[PDB]
Amino acid sequence: MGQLYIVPTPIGNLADITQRALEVLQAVDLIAAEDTRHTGLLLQHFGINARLFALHQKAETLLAKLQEGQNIALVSDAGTPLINDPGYHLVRTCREAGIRVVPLPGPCAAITALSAAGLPSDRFCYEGFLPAKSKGRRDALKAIEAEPRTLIFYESTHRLLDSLEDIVAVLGESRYVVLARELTKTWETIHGAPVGELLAWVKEDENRRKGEMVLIVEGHKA
Amino acid sequence: MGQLYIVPTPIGNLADITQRALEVLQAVDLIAAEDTRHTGLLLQHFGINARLFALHEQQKAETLLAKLQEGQNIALVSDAGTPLINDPGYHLVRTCREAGIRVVPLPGPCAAITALSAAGLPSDRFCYEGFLPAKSKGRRDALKAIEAEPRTLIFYESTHRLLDSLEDIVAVLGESRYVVLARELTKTWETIHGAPVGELLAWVKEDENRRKGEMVLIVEGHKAQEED
Numbered sequence: 001m002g003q004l005y006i007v008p009t010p011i012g013n014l015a016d017i018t019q020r021a022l023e024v025l026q027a028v029d030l031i032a033a034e035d036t037r038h039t040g041l042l043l044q045h046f047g048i049n050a051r052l053f054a055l056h057q058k059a060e061t062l063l064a065k066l067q068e069g070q071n072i073a074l075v076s077d078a079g080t081p082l083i084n085d086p087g088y089h090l091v092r093t094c095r096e097a098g099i100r101v102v103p104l105p106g107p108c109a110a111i112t113a114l115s116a117a118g119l120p121s122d123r124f125c126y127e128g129f130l131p132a133k134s135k136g137r138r139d140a141l142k143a144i145e146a147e148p149r150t151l152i153f154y155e156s157t158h159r160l161l162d163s164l165e166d167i168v169a170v171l172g173e174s175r176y177v178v179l180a181r182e183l184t185k186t187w188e189t190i191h192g193a194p195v196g197e198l199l200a201w202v203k204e205d206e207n208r209r210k211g212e213m214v215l216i217v218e219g220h221k222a
Numbered sequence: 223m224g225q226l227y228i229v230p231t232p233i234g235n236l237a238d239i240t241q242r243a244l245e246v247l248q249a250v251d252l253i254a255a256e257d258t259r260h261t262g263l264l265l266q267h268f269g270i271n272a273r274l275f276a277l278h279e280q281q282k283a284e285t286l287l288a289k290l291q292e293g294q295n296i297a298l299v300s301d302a303g304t305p306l307i308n309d310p311g312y313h314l315v316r317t318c319r320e321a322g323i324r325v326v327p328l329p330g331p332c333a334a335i336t337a338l339s340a341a342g343l344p345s346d347r348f349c350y351e352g353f354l355p356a357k358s359k360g361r362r363d364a365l366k367a368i369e370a371e372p373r374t375l376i377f378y379e380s381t382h383r384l385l386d387s388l389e390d391i392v393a394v395l396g397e398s399r400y401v402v403l404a405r406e407l408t409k410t411w412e413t414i415h416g417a418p419v420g421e422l423l424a425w426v427k428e429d430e431n432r433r434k435g436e437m438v439l440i441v442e443g444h445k446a447q448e449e450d
């Protein structure tokens with residue numbers, strides 16, 4: 001009976017790899033990836049030759065191979081699979097079929113940003129992406145506006161300015177927010193301020209919203 | 223001016239440390255640790271000879287801030303997993319941030335996330351709740367405050383309180399709420415078992431081994447019910 005390995009990958013820095021990750025990737029019969037080409041680049045950097053299987057169900061196909069006794073590693077493009085990344089259907093399928101699922105610890109952008117924010121982390125909520133539509137986004141924000149826990153959002157560069165102005169609008173312009181940009185890359189920048197002043201600070205320079213970002217929002221006073 | 227590095231460490235398997243963590247732990251002037259003896263043992267496995275600083279005080283945060291300002295680089299670690307995630311360091315990071323000191327987080331092991339990735343529950347959104355109160359009365363109140371939460375919930379629980387805690391979860395959340403018990407992740411006794419919580423509680427009681435070691439609880443969020 002085969003096993004499924006969940007294997008987190010770097011989020012922009014290739015030294016953020018672990019030895020057990022490299023050993024699992026090289027040992028499994030098959031690697032199910034989000035994008036076979038991103039992962040191929042990654043594998044070639046570490047001198048690992050492996051069979052890739054694209055993850056565009058397909059769960060049932062991979063399930064059969066596991067029952068045939070094949071070991072499978074699930075990876076995503078960056079970070080930890082199933083955290084706003086594919087694989088939720090496969091793990092469900094495998095688990096009720098009695099397939100052992102083995103998670104490797106590794107990089108996760110949300111936790112990485114939270115560890116550097118200087119905000120209360122005894123409790124937090126992970127919200128993923130805000131809605132793209134301005135109305136739907138203001139409604140998600142009103143929905144959590146009272147939440148006392150630290151909130152973590154993933155946000156896109158094109159939508160940051162609009163998201164931030166809505167946040168000012170709904171949560172108020174003195175709500176402390178930490179913007180974590182391009183974690184573990186050369187450009188890495190983490191800056192926190194009252195969200196009013198943060199929005200002002202971001203607009204001063206266009207580059208301050210370039211690349212991948214996480215927002216850490218302080219929770220309501222309570 | 224020096225920088226403050228936030229450095230995750232293994233949660234039971236030495237091959238889970240990142241290569242960059244090893245690089246940083248060997249390059250900084252000082253390692254500030256939750257427990258210098260526990261950290262000493264980890265460093266020893268990797269041949270690393272380092273200067274350790276005990277965090278056991280905004281007083282000590284002021285000490286470290288001073289070193290950073292005179293140009294010293296500092297790494298912060300906890301006994302396991304990611305610092306600040308139910309581990310000290312929060313005030314130090316804050317103090318450094320408001321003084322212009324750059325904080326550099328390294329990604330790495332975190333038990334909550336590791337468990338979540340393999341639990342088979344919705345992770346589109348989730349709540350990290352940490353440790354439930356140790357006393358049953360306190361614990362039941364904390365559970366009542368989140369009974370209606372629709373997001374997947376994550377809890378840390380101790381081996382000595384798991385059976386009591388599971389009894390209170392049955393009682394407050396109901397015996398059918400799906401819960402996953404992730405035990406001894408990355409260790410040789412690793413076991414991830416999910417079930418309606420009343421069944422989970424019974425399953426655990428069959429064999430005392432099933433509650434030994436370190437554990438995460440992944441709890442299915444609340445679904446709407448007519449009985450209300």
Ligand SMILES: C[S@@+](CC[C@H](N)C(=O)[O-])C[C@H]1O[C@@H](n2cnc3c(N)ncnc32)[C@H](O)[C@@H]1O
Pocket residue numbers: 011012076078079080081082083084085107108109110153154155156180181182183184185212213214
């Ligand atoms: C679809 S998600 C993948 C999340 C990933 N699986 C993880 O482990 O967090 C991609 C989003 O994560 C966040 N992210 C990923 N890498 C990042 C980095 N290096 N710095 C800041 N945010 C990052 C960004 O918000 C980006 O839009």
Ligand SMILES: C[S@@+](CC[C@H](N)C(=O)[O-])C[C@H]1O[C@@H](n2cnc3c(N)ncnc32)[C@H](O)[C@@H]1O
Pocket residue numbers: 233234300302303304305306307308309331332333334377378379380404405406407408409436437438
């Ligand atoms: C105070 S916390 C430290 C959390 C750590 N900072 C992290 O990022 O995961 C310790 C608790 O985390 C959970 N934990 C740590 N290691 C674990 C493992 N290998 N398997 C299951 N749970 C673990 C247990 O509930 C343990 O009592």
